């Protein structure tokens, strides 16, 4: 069902001298859910219950997001993809995930998850993905209605938009969810970002890292690498397409539809489709895992 209540109990662990928060419920091989910008583990709260008893259900809060510690001192050079990866790699190592992991990914969680999977392919039993960065992109591949705003994020205007005015949390997030969010839902999303200034840096650093038209070169290379790999990998995949969808449409979707050993379903949603179709998404992931774990 829907609902504003989080799933399970938030746990904390020290990673690289910072405390990171995560959900870890049940036993067995992990089903690892990774949020992106500007969300947290909370994104998966109505999806994870569908996988009850099918494995160890894990959802991590990226550094500086959800209940995880802020980097200090924060600034324009902090919260790059590379920095997030250092923390997330270390957290996933610390969690003792084993060698039959099912990844469930979204948004920046997909760049992180696809990259981790490429680097740990022997340990990946299946990949479920939705509204994901399937490859490096060109401006023509980016949703037309958001081009100007994301171009602004990736300019000097970004600090005022995001650090001062919290535009990613307050405008982009509800703007890309079809159903109206409740007071409690928005409260949970805005909580890590209540204070103006550097507390909001992760939500600006992320749009500045999207691999678009060759920049930033490091993230472009990472996405190019996992794009080539996923197009050839026989690891089972679940592609949760969305209607109308948002990011994973056009050429981005044309590409991921070439990936081998892939099941696809379509659900209602724009970008943050977890808020529109959690039961359909959860049911599909559960069925995927059951087939992977007979």
Q: Where along the sequence are the contacts to Cl ion (CB under 5 A)?
A: 37, 206-207
Q: How many angstroms from the chain centroid is the CA of residue 120?
A: 18
Residue 38 or 282 having the CB closest to Cl ion? 38
Tell me which of Cl ion, Ca ion, none is bound by residue 174, counting a contact when its beta carbon lies within the kind-specific cut-off of 5 to 8 angstroms: Ca ion
Compute how many other C-beta atoms are within 10 angstroms of the C-beta atom of residue 285. 25
Tell me which of Cl ion, Ca ion, none is bound by residue 250, counting a contact when its beta carbon lies within the kind-specific cut-off of 5 to 8 angstroms: none
Rounded Cα–Cα distance for residues 281 and 271 (Å): 13
Contact 144, 9 (CB under 8 A): no
Q: Is 271 a catalytic residue?
A: yes
From 69, 83, 115, 131, the catalytic residue: 131
- Minimum Å distance from CB 246 to Ca ion? 12
Tell me which of Ca ion, Cl ion, none is bound by residue 66, counting a contact when its beta carbon lies within the kind-specific cut-off of 5 to 8 angstroms: none
Residue 79 or 206 having the CB closest to Cl ion? 206
Rounded Cα–Cα distance for residues 90 and 94 (Å): 6
- Minimum Å distance from CB 111 to Cl ion? 10
Instruction: Give the binding site for Ca ion (CB under 5 A).
Output: 174, 177
- Taking Cα atoms as reference points, which of 84, 107, 69 lies closest to residue 198? 69
- Minimum Å distance from CB 37 to Cl ion? 4
Residue 41 or 282 having the CB closest to Cl ion? 41
Q: What are phi and psi of 94, to 5 degrees?
A: -60, -25
Residue 10 or 271 having the CB closest to Cl ion? 271
Q: Is 107 a catalytic residue?
A: yes
Query: Diameter of the chain by CA atoms?
Result: 52
Tell me which of Cl ion, Ca ion, none is bound by residue 206, counting a contact when its beta carbon lies within the kind-specific cut-off of 5 to 8 angstroms: Cl ion
What's the half-sphere exposure (Cβ side, CA atoms, 13 Å) at 4?
A: 10
CB contact set of 281 (below 8 Å; sequence gap of 6+): 47, 130, 240, 267, 273, 274
Active site residues: 107, 131, 271
Annotation: binding site: 174, 177
């Amino acid at each position: 069902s829907l609902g504003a209540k989080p799933f399970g109990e938030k746990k904390f662990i020290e990673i690289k001298g910072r405390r990171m928060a995560y959900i870890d419920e049940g036993t067995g091989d992990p089903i690892l859910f990774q949020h992106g910008n500007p969300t947290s583990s909370y994104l998966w709260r109505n999806i994870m219950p569908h996988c009850a008893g099918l494995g160890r259900l894990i959802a991590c809060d990226l550094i500086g997001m959800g209940d995880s510690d802020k980097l200090d001192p924060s600034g324009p050079e902090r919260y790059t993809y590379a920095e997030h990866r250092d923390y997330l790699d270390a957290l996933w190592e610390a969690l003792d995930l084993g060698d039959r992991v099912v990844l469930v990914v979204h948004d920046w969680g997909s760049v992180l998850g696809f990259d981790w999977a490429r680097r740990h392919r022997e340990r990946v039993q299946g990949i479920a993905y939705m509204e994901a960065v399937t490859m490096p992109i060109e401006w023509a591949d980016f949703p037309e209605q958001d081009r100007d705003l994301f171009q602004a994020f990736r300019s000097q205007a970004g600090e005022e938009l995001v650090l001062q005015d919290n535009v990613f949390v307050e405008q982009v997030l509800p703007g890309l969810i079809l159903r109206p969010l409740s007071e409690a839902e928005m409260a949970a999303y805005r909580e890590p970002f209540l204070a103006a200034g550097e507390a909001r840096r992760p939500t600006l650093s992320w749009p500045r890292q999207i691999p678009i038209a060759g920049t930033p070169a490091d993230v472009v290379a990472i996405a190019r690498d996992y794009a080539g790999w996923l197009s050839e990998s026989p690891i089972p995949k679940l592609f949760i397409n969305a209607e109308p969808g948002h990011l994973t449409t056009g050429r981005i979707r044309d590409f991921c539809r070439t990936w081998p050993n892939q099941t696809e379903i379509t659900v209602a949603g724009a970008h943050f489709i977890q808020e529109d179709s959690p039961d359909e998404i959860g049911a599909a992931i559960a069925a995927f895992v059951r087939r992977l774990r007979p």
